[PDB]
Design a protein around this ligand. Structure first.
Ligand SMILES: [Pt+2]
Ligand SMILES: [Pt+2]
Ligand SMILES: [Pt+2]
Ligand SMILES: [Pt+2]
Ligand SMILES: [Pt+2]
Ligand SMILES: [Pt+2]
Ligand SMILES: [Pt+2]
Ligand SMILES: [Pt+2]
Lengths: 294, 294, 294, 279, 279, 294
């Protein structure tokens, strides 16, 4: 005869399952390769726990996703050991400002840094923020793909990148789309890119470019993207869903995302284009990550 | 001096309580007879845990209530060993469609099935879904009470039951209220019922019957209920509260239910009629199912 | 080419429709017989407007329904000329306290009062409030049906009615259900009722009666209703829907009510009993009051 | 005295009363009607039909997405619909009951509708059958959208069998309708054989990966994989962007004006957007 | 596999399992207990009593504001309460039923409670009578808060008649209790005659402007007009500040450390804040 | 017999009342002296209407309150004629940034400007914003009381004021509390104030002052307020209520505010202090304004 209400009863059964499997699941944890906490409010305490339990392990973490986690500077510092384990680090939509950039800077300067992909989009970094970040990028050798989409850089921000870029020698992809920047800033950076030793791709769409500004960019092999007309197209939609995840019919949003995943698999299967396959597989990555979060 | 916030502090106290009592409550679990998880979102993982901890035990589970649990087909399959333990199985309000009917079908066909009462109301089963369900019912001997209220059947659905019914020989009560069906379907089913070897009671209220349709049914001993206006009266009332529980004022609803519970006790004590009593005992169980769930 | 947004555009079309039809609908207004404003927040200004436009007219207002209107004492005073036109006056769910009882008192004492049915349920009137109300009732001859369900009366309140009742000579029905009262208060009132020259029906269900308390009442022709378990059955059901109307799924509730309405029609047509019919006619009016309000 | 909103209401009345003659003229010369998102009750319906039932111009666009429209409201709104070149009725919970009214709209001698968008309504196969009869006797409609309308197997086979009865249809969207390999194939076949049909959408159905290739390999153009416009059309229906909206046209226009043989496909993908922008 | 929250739950379990011995020690030496805002069901109550029913230290503060506590929960929590120096129970919907349990808490030989905050509970005059009996046999409580507890006329007169039965009460808050001129005056009188009572709060009652002057003109200090601390105490109960919170102490501390004869009143007004800051 | 649902029926009666009283109320409007639209979303269209109907009239508008109106730069420009009528203008909590400051600048430079009190608090003006505003203040002679509480000024912002202040010769009260500014900025401004020809009162509380910074300020007759320990105390509470108005129990919040108003009246009546009376009367102003808004 049951004394515990439904949710309290389930909590209780969880505890027992978790108690009985403690030794087995402890081993499983030390061998994790992926860590998705997108959409959970990472308070100081949760931050502390994640660093304690996962601050060390056998393998690198192929991916660490903390999109939309309401992360602050302090949480960042606490999570440093976990980030040092990461190859891909997603920190989008976390409200990070210049304060947090000092901590990222140190993460990038750290001898143990093995981050190849860093996504900092949809955080109000600021020009001040990026300047600080740039210094970390100056002494880093691991990072090949960096995203700064919609991070409040503006003119000042992009000119700073343009001037400083060549101090990093391994960066391959930089995304600076949607940052309120005008014609000359955009051009200075486009110029720096083409002169860069490693930089293969630069995103400049959704900035405040005039139509003549665009042509100049277009006419200027580091590849400059000035218009949305491919995986990036997708990124920005899925940015919206990630935003509104909590706000929508979960069961519906799940099926939109399942069909889109299926849809992506096949388009990937049925072209032989290397760069097409790579672009789709990227979108597969973002979609799987939203499903998980549901 | 306290470092954790209120809910975080309570979690921590829970863990310690649970840790200290582990041996004692592990024993309590193994001799459970009732399982109410109504209103909790039963994700794959919760499904997995419940199957693991409660998949086996001493006694049958006199009742298993998972109304309003956002259960999918997969979670169903996971939960099959728990369902095989159940005498009474509530799965209302779970968004189950035709997909989930195959799993129910197999549950009903399983040699170990000892389910007597199966409530599937407020799930979009469909005519397709009930066709599949019917096949399971064909090879079942345990189920005596089946509820299909508001399951999307329509004319196609009820005509199907009418044609297939006599393939089951132990069914006593069938609720097909509120299913969008018209006069002839309802009449074909009412006909099949009266010729059925076991079927004692069929519910047809809240369908799309014409006033002449209803008299025909009325004039037609399997008893046919065509109008709500006792145990089913309140069933639909409570079914309604069941949708909206956490979704509106808790304390107020708690008191309404306590007073209603009390009104029913007294009503039951003041009748000698074995039938009336039994009808009322049903409703108290439902009130108690909601009280607990609060 | 459209400049206004959707709702703003609709407002503008409304104005023009209203402007064109001004003379015609002004006439329609002057011969209204019914006034349902249930669910709208009746502020001082809305109160003022309604009094101004409808303070006078040809006919009596067969019914005035202002349930759930967040009405205060002042708005009451404002609305007095409209209330003097009313045969039936619904003021449930308006948060009326003792303050508002003086205004009701005066309404009941007014020479032009022709209110027959006054429903004050779900307002925290209080024993103090009912004392004041009672004085009005003492000098009234129009009111035959009075509802005080869940108005905070308690023992003090019901004892008051018991002592004062016979001062009114035309009252036929009194609902004092769900008022927190105990066995003796309920018994004193039930006693006063049976000795009352006119009082045909007293409701006492959902009070804090003991099971022995209830039998006593039951064993005690003024009819005393001690248990819910027909017209009052649903009253409390609907009273519940009435709280939560816009607050939850509209289309679903619309359909439930349409089907219920329909179930009641048919039930009424299928009984010859003049009493049953009348009970059911009451409930349809209430269903229709909710339908309209949607 | 007047609280803020009530005071604003009162100012509106007076502004509206002083400008009555002037704005009455403006209305009769309206060419667009967007009521997307307002709950169109019987009364609101009645008012719209009264005030806008007739006018000088055709209504270049009529948008009533997400208006909680019922069959009755539909009948009331018919004289307004008859004025419409483009008619949006997405997300209105329209079922088979409403399809009779649509049927009669399509069959009406005055029908001037070129684009009809019925997506995200539970039409059903029963509903589309009835709709198809209207389409059979229509000559105005060139673009029809049936995205996520509960058609399934039965529904798409119906279209495949009945389509060639219409001779002016250019674009048919039947994406996201729960349909499998054969139904999708039947309809893809019918499309290629169709005298007018230039584009068929079949993405987000229940196709197998071999189903897809067959479709792909099969000039009516069949779209089987969303992966060149319909991207938000599927998801934009879930919220029902504050900058992103215009920035796709601001982006696709500055890209429409920098290309030959496929300068057209940029335009009708800009138009699927230019829709949702104001829509 | 594990979704984000479920994965976090699992990490928590493991962190909690590894640290069990260590944090068990930490708990037994807790001195503060704040559960403000969590719905304390029977089970949660039971757990708290089990794990924290006994310990080394007194609990310098126990805060359970806004916890949806009932009478039963109260009884369950008694052994925890007995450990408390300061006990907050505001906003818990406590009525006369609960007052018996409070009464017994106050009468208990082990009662060490100095500050008891019962505001924004519908105690009632019936409730306060019962509470008063407990207060009669209590010696620990120096600060009692009855702000907005439905006392009225009847309630305050009761206090006035019964007060002198307690001899250690220093501060009584009966603000915002719907009481009129005479009740307020009776109680103000009783206070001035009281052996210990240093401060009585009477603001936000139903006093007339002449009532106020009489009170004003009448050393137990009677506060009749909120216009030197209780400012948010009245409104802070409505939300139940992200910077404003600390900035009042950050402001009142840097003002507590720049003054003599009334350096004390800055402190106990800082303490009414220093409460709500963590509370 | 009624055809219109409750809210639609009330709309209809409003229209008729408003139609019948058109001539009378038209006259009333032209003689308005006060305009409170606090808390309504002032869209372009509403802005347009308010300027049309109230762009001119007989009297000055003793007060114009548009707190919490979601006003943009464009709405501001549209509302310019109404603002030119105003003696006191409240524009708090409107999200105004540097963009809007050009429009305020022009409002202050306008020959017809008769604004004495301008409240711009809780808008992210910025140092850039204030610089622009300062220029308008340089050519204004009407404004005696200016509030810039929490407008994102910081160090840069306050130093700008300090340097520019003496260009205005009639300013009496400046509020720059809660603007993230440090010791020297605060001191420079305090210094400028004491040297100012007219400035009687300067608020500097809730800035980032060190305790030694405070003493220096304190030790430094223009009156400098460095700590909250009076009407200003209140302002900032009522700032919170105004914020959360829509979010709270309106009936409750109304009674808190009624009792506080009563409370204020009396404390004003029962001290003879001129400056005390003026401070309370200010709080009376803010409270009455919230009540109205309810
Ligand atoms: Pt943005
Ligand atoms: Pt759907
Ligand atoms: Pt186990
Ligand atoms: Pt109640
Ligand atoms: Pt009139
Ligand atoms: Pt339904
Ligand atoms: Pt702030
Ligand atoms: Pt209250």
């Amino acid at each position: 005869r049951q004394v515990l209400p439904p949710s309290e009863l389930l909590d209780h059964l969880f505890f027992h399952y978790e108690f009985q499997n403690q030794r087995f699941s402890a081993e499983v944890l030390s061998s994790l390769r992926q860590l998705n906490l997108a959409g959970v409010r990472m308070t100081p305490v949760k931050c502390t726990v994640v660093a304690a339990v996962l601050g060390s392990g056998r393998h690198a973490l192929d991916e660490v996703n903390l999109a939309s986690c309401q992360l602050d500077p302090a949480g960042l510092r606490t999570l440093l050991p976990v980030f040092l384990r990461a190859r891909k680090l997603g920190l989008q939509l976390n409200s990070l400002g210049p304060e947090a950039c000092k901590d990222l800077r140190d993460l990038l300067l750290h001898d143990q840094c093995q981050i190849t992909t860093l996504r900092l989009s949809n955080n109000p970094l600021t020009a001040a923020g990026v300047a600080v970040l740039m210094e970390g990028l100056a002494g880093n050798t691991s990072v090949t793909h960096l995203s700064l989409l919609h991070t409040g850089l503006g003119d000042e921000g992009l000119e700073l990148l343009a001037a400083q870029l060549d101090r990093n020698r391994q960066l391959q992809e930089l995304n600076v789309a949607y940052n309120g920047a005008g014609d000359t800033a955009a051009l200075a950076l486009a110029r720096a890119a083409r002169e860069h030793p490693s930089l293969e791709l630069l995103h400049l769409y959704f900035n405040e470019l005039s139509s003549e500004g665009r042509q100049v960019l277009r006419d200027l092999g580091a590849r400059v993207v000035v218009s949305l007309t491919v995986s990036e197209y997708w990124s920005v939609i899925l940015s919206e869903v990630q935003r509104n995840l909590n706000s929508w019919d979960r069961a519906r949003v799940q099926r939109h995302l399942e069909l889109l995943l299926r849809d992506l698999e096949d388009s990937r299967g049925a072209t032989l284009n290397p760069w097409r396959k790579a672009q789709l597989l990227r979108v597969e990555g973002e979609v799987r990550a939203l499903l998980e979060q549901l």
